[PDB]
PDB file of C-alpha atoms in Angstrom:
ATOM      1  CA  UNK A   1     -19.933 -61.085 -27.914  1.00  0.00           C
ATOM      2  CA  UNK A   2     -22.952 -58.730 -26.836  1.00  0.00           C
ATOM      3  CA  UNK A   3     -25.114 -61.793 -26.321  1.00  0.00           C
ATOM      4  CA  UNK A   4     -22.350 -62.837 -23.587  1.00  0.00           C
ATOM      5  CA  UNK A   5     -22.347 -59.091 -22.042  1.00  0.00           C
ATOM      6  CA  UNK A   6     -26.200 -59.229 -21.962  1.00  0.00           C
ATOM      7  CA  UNK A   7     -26.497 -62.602 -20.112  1.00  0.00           C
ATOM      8  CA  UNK A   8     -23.969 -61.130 -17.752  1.00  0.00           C
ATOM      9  CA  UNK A   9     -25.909 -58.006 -17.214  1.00  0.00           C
ATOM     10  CA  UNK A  10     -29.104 -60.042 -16.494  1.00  0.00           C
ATOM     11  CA  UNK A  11     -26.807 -61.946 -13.756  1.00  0.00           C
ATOM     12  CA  UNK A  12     -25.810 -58.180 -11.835  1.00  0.00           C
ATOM     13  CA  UNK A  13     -29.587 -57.561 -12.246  1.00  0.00           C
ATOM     14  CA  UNK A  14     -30.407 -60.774 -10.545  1.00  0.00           C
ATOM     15  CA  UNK A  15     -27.924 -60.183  -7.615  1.00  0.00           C
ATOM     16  CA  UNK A  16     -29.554 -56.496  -7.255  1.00  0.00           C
ATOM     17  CA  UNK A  17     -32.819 -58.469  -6.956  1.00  0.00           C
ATOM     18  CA  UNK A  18     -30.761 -60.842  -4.269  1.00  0.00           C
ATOM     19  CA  UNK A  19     -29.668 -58.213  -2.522  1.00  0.00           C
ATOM     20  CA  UNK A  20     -32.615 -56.118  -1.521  1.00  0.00           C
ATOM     21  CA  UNK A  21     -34.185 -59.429  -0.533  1.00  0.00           C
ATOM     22  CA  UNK A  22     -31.676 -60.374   2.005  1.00  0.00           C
ATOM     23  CA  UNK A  23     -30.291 -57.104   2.840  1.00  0.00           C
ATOM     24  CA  UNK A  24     -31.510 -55.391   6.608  1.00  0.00           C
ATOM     25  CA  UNK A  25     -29.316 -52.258   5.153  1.00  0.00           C
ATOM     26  CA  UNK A  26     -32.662 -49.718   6.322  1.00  0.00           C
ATOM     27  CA  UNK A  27     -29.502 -44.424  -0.597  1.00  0.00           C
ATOM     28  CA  UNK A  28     -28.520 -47.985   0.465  1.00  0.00           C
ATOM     29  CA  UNK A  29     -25.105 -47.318   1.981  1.00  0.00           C
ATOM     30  CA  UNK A  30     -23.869 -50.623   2.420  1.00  0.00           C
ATOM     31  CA  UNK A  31     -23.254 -51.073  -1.362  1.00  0.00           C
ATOM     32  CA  UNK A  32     -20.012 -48.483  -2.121  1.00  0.00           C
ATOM     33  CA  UNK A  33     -18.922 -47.439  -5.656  1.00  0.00           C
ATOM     34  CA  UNK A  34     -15.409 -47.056  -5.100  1.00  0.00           C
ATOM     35  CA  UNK A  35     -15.329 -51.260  -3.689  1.00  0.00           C
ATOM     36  CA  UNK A  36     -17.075 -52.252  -7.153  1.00  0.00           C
ATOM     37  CA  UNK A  37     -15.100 -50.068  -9.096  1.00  0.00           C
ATOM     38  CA  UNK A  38     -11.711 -51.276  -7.295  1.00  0.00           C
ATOM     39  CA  UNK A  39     -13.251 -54.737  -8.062  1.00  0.00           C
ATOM     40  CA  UNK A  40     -14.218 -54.732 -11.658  1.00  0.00           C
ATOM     41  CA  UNK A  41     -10.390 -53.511 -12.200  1.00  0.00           C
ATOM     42  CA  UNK A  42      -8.217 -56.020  -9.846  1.00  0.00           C
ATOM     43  CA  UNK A  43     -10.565 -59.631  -9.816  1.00  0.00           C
ATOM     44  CA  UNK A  44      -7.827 -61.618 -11.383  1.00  0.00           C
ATOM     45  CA  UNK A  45      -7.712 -63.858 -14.486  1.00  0.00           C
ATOM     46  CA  UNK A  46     -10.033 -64.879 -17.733  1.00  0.00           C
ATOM     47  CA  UNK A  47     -13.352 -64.658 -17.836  1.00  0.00           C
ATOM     48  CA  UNK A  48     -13.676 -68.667 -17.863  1.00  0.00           C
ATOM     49  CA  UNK A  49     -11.996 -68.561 -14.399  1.00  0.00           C
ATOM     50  CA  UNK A  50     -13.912 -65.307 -13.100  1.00  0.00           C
ATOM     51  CA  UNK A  51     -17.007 -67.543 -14.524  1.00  0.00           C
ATOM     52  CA  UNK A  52     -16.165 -70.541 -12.409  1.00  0.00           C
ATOM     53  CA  UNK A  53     -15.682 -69.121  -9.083  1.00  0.00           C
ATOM     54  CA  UNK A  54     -19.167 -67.646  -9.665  1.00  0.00           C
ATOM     55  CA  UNK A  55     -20.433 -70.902 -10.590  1.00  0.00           C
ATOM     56  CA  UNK A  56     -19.334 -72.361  -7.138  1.00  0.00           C
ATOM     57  CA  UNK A  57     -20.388 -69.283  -5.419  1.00  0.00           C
ATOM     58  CA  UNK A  58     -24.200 -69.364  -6.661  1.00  0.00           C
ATOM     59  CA  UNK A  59     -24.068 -73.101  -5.761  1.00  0.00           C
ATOM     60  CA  UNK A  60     -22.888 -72.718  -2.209  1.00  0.00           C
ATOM     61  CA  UNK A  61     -25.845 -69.926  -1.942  1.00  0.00           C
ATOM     62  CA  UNK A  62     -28.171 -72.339  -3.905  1.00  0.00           C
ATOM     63  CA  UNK A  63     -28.047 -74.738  -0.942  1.00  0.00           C
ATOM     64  CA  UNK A  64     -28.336 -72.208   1.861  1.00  0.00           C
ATOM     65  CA  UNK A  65     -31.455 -71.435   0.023  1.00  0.00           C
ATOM     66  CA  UNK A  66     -32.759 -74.482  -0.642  1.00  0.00           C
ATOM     67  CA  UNK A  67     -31.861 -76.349   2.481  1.00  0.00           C
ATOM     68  CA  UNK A  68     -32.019 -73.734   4.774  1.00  0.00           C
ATOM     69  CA  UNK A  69     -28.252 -74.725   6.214  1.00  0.00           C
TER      70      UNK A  69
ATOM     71  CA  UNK B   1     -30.501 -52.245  15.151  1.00  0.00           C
ATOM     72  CA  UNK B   2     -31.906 -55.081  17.492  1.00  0.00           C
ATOM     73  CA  UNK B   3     -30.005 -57.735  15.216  1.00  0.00           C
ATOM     74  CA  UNK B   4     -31.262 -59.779  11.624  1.00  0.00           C
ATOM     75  CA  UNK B   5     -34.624 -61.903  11.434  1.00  0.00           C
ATOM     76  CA  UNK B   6     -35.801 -64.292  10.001  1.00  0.00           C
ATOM     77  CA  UNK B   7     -36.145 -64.631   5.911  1.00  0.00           C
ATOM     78  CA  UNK B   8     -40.208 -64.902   4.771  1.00  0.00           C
ATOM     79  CA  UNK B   9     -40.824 -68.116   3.075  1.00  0.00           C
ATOM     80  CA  UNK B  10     -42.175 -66.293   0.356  1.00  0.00           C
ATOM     81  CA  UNK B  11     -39.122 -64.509   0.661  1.00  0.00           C
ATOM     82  CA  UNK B  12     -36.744 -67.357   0.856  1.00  0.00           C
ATOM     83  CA  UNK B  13     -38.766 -68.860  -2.050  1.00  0.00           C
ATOM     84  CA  UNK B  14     -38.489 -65.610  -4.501  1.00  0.00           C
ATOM     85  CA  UNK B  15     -34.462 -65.590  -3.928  1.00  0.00           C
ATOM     86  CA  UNK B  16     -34.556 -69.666  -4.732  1.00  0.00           C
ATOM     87  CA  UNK B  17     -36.334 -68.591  -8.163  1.00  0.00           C
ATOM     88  CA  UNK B  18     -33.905 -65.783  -8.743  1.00  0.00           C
ATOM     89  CA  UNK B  19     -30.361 -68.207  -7.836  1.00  0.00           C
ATOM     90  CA  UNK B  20     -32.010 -70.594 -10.529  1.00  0.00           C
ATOM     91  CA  UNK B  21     -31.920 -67.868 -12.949  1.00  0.00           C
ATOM     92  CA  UNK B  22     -28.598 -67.469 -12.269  1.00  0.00           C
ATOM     93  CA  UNK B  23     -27.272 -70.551 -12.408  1.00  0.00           C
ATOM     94  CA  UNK B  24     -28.939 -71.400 -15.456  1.00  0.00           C
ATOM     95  CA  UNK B  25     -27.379 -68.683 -16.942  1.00  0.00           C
ATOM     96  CA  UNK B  26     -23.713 -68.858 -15.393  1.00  0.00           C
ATOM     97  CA  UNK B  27     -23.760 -72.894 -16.922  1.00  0.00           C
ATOM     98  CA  UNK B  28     -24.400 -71.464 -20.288  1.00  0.00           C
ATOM     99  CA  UNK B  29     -21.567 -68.930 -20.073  1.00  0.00           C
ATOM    100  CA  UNK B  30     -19.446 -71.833 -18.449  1.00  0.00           C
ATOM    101  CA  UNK B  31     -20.124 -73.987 -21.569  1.00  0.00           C
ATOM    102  CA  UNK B  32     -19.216 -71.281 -23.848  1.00  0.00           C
ATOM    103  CA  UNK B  33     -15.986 -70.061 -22.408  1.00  0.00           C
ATOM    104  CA  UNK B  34     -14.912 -73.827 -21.889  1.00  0.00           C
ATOM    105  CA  UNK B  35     -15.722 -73.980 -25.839  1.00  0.00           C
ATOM    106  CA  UNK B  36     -13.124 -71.464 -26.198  1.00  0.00           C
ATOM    107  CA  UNK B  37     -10.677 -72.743 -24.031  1.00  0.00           C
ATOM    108  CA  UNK B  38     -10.471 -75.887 -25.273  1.00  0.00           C
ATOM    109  CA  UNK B  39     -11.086 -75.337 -28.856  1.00  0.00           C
ATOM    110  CA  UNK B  40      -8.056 -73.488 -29.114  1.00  0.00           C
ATOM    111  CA  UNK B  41      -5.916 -76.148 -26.920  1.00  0.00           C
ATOM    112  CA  UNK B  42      -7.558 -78.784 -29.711  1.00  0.00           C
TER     113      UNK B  42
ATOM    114  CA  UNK C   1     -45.034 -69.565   0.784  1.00  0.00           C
ATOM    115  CA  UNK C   2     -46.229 -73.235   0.363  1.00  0.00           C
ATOM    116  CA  UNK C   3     -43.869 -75.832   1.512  1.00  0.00           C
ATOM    117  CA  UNK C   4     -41.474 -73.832   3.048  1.00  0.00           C
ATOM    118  CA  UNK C   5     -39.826 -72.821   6.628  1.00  0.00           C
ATOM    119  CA  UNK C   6     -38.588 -69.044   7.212  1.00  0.00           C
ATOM    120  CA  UNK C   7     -34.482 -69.107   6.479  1.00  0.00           C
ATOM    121  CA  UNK C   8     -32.432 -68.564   9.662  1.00  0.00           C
ATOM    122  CA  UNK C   9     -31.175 -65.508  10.636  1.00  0.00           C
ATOM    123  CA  UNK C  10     -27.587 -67.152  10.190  1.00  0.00           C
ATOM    124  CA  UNK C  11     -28.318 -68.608   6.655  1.00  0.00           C
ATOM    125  CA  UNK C  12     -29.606 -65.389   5.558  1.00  0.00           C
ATOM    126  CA  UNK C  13     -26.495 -63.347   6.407  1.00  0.00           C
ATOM    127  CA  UNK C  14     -24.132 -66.273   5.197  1.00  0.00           C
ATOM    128  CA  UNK C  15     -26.004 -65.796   1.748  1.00  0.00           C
ATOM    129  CA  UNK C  16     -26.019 -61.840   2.057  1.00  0.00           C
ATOM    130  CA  UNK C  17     -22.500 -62.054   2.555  1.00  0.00           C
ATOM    131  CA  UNK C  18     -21.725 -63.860  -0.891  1.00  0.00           C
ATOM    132  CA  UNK C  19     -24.310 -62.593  -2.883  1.00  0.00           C
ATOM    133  CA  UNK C  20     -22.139 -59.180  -2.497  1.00  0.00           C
ATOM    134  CA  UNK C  21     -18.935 -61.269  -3.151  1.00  0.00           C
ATOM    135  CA  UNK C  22     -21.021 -62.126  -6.547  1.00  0.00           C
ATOM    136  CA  UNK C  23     -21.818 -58.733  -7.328  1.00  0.00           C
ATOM    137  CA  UNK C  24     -18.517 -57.148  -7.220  1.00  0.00           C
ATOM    138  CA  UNK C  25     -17.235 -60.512  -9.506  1.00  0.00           C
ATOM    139  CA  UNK C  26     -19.630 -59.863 -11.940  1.00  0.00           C
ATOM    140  CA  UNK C  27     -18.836 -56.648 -12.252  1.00  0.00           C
ATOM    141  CA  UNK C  28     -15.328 -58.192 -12.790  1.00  0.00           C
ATOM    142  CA  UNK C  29     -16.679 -60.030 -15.325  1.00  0.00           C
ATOM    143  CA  UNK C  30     -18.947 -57.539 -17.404  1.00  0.00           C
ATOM    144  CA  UNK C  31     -15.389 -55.593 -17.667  1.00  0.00           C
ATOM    145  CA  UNK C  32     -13.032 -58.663 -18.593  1.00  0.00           C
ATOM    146  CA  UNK C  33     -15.698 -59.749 -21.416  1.00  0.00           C
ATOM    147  CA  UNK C  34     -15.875 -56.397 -22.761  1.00  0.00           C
ATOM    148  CA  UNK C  35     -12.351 -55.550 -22.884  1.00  0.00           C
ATOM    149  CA  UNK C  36     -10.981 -58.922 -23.302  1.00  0.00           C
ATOM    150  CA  UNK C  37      -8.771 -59.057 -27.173  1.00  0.00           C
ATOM    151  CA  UNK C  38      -7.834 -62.189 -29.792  1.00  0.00           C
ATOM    152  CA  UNK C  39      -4.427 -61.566 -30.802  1.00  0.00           C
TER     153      UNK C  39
END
């Protein structure tokens, strides 16, 4: 659904937000076009399963944030 | 090129603010893709 | 930044690290959901 392609949108935005906040990259090189193109065509499986590794992934970096460790 | 420092609070604080955003968001897409999943199995 | 110690060098770059993991998944993802087909 475009409601589902919009949330997920707002989510890259987010991690673009993420990025330049942690980043010490000093045309930001360290992010390469050809990696997230070769990534948006071979992460494997469903979106529910794409969805859940993110869903662990945010949590892990959830408690780095909030707990420092 | 003298090696990483430390996050700002208000730094640390602004990318705790954005990973709730997130994570609010990826449970709602979790929810609905699970809906999916197992309405179909059902 | 009430409340709230500076984040470690370390933790920083442990969270860099997957925050770019997440960005080239969600790219994944924003190309699954669009091309994704009920047959």
């Amino acid at each position: 659904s475009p409601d589902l392609l919009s949330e997920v949108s707002e989510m890259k935005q987010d991690l673009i937000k993420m990025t330049a906040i942690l980043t010490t990259d000093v045309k930001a090189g360290s992010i390469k076009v050809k990696e997230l193109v070769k990534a948006a065509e071979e992460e494997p499986g469903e979106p529910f399963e794409i969805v859940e590794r993110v869903k662990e992934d945010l949590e892990k970096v959830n408690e780095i944030l909030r707990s420092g460790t | 090129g003298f090696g990483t420092s430390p996050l700002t609070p208000s730094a640390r604080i602004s990318a705790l603010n954005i990973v709730g955003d997130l994570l609010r968001k990826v449970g709602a897409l979790e929810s609905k893709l699970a809906a999916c999943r197992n309405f179909a199995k059902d």
